[PDB]
Design a protein around this ligand. Structure first.
Ligand SMILES: Cc1nc2cc(-c3ccc(Br)cc3)nn2c(C)c1CCC(=O)O
Length: 404
């Protein structure tokens, strides 16, 4: 029970809101505006309930504590947000200090202000790199001044930046105001994850894909305490199948360090009564390339020398659909093939099709140009944060919110 924005009285108040506007950019303009979109409901709520101002703060990229306004400025985000809000956004070329404080001290009623990239200061992350690429540490008195300056910019604080909530950064745990509320995005992410983690509908299926095994050990370990079924798919599966079945895997991804714990994970699954589904067939490629020659293989055939599996095949898609069919709650993290490449996308799109059907019949479905909004219960906006939650860790940014 943390304070949320809907329970905060903002009438006549300056709202300082941490958002996640760390959007994809191409040299350098906005390629996907979904994170910006995702914040509008909190922003409008504030303006609709009489807030005097909304001061928005975020990072963009990894400028590493160096001001990089030619490369990583938030300026284009002000223009995009104006389009999406239907309201003027003032952009400020810094995020702390006397001119910014004065600008945010008493804005005209209803003013939306977006500050420049917080990570242009080393005090946000607390560590950074210099102009030469060497590591620098922030000084405590400077971190204190930075956090104090941010704290002046609002009367109340909102954190809607679930994508950054795993970082104990100044804008996340250092704002000292009497009320610190989660935004509606934050609320939605924590509710889908708390529900799922602590009181799952059943059966609860975890679908885990991605490339490396060793970086998902704790994820799998924690999820085996919560779930009833688990598909281990995608690039990870080859390490499992090599160890458990002595499968011939070609040049498929193999994690030497993960391989040591495969059997340990399968034991924990056997100990908690979790039914594990691995793939049984593959689309193969002659090299790691979008237009590689393709082939087909099974666990029993092996993958031929020099070839790699980049997708599951049709029999796997069936077994995966059977598990999705049985589930009343699904959490999916990581794809089941190289879905950016059409030839290796069928498995992922097929599994998505199933998850969308499941949603239609009341399955709670969580995925860690498309209106994906209508089709699944929840698409998470934060990769690393949602992983850290799935691994069973506390998020500093959530823990810092006010209780009530
Ligand atoms: C960057 C990268 N990402 C992925 C992802 C996948 C991948 C993902 C799914 C499946 Br099924 C099979 C392979 N392979 N892969 C490789 C070989 C690379 C490059 C080399 C490596 O990091 O091992």
């Amino acid at each position: 029970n943390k304070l949320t924005l809907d329970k905060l009285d903002v009438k006549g108040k300056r709202v300082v809101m941490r958002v996640d506007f760390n959007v994809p950019m191409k040299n350098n303009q906005i390629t996907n505006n979904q994170r910006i979109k995702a914040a509008v409901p909190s922003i409008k709520f504030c303006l609709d309930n009489g807030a005097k101002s909304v001061v928005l703060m975020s990072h963009l990229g990894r400028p590493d504590g160096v001001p990089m306004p030619d490369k990583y400025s938030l300026e284009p985000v002000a223009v995009e947000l104006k389009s999406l809000l239907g309201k003027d956004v003032l952009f400020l070329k810094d995020c702390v200090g006397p001119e910014v404080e004065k600008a945010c001290a008493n804005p005209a009623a209803g003013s939306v202000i977006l500050l420049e990239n917080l990570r242009f200061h080393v005090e946000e992350e607390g560590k950074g790199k210099d102009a030469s690429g060497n590591k620098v540490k922030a000084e405590p008195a400077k971190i204190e001044a930075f956090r104090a300056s941010l704290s002046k910019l609002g009367d109340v604080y909102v954190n809607d930046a679930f994508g950054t909530a795993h970082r104990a950064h100044s804008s996340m745990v250092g704002v000292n105001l009497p009320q610190k509320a989660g935004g509606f995005l934050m609320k939605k992410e924590l509710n889908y994850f708390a529900k799922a983690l602590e009181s799952p509908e059943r059966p609860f299926l975890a679908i885990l894909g991605g490339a490396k095994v060793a970086d998902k050990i704790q994820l799998i370990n924690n999820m085996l305490d919560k779930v009833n079924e688990m598909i281990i798919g995608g690039g990870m599966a080859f390490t499992f199948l090599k160890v458990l079945n002595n499968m011939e895997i070609g040049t498929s991804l193999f994690d030497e360090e993960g391989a040591k714990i495969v059997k340990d994970l399968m034991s924990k699954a056997e100990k908690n009564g979790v039914k594990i589904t691995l793939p049984v067939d593959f689309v193969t490629a002659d090299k790691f390339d979008e237009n590689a020659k393709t082939g087909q293989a099974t666990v029993a055939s092996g993958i031929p020398a020099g070839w790699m599996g980049l997708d599951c095949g049709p029999e796997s898609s069936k077994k995966y659909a059977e598990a999705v069919t049985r589930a009343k709650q699904i959490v999916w993290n990581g794809p089941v093939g190289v879905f950016e490449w059409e030839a290796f996308a069928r498995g992922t799109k097929a599994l998505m099709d199933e998850v969308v059907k499941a949603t239609s019949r009341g399955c709670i479905t969580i995925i860690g140009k498309w209106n994906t909004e209508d089709k699944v219960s929840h698409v998470s906006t934060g990769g690393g944060a949602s992983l850290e939650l799935l691994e069973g860790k506390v998020l500093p940014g959530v823990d810092a919110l006010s209780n009530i």
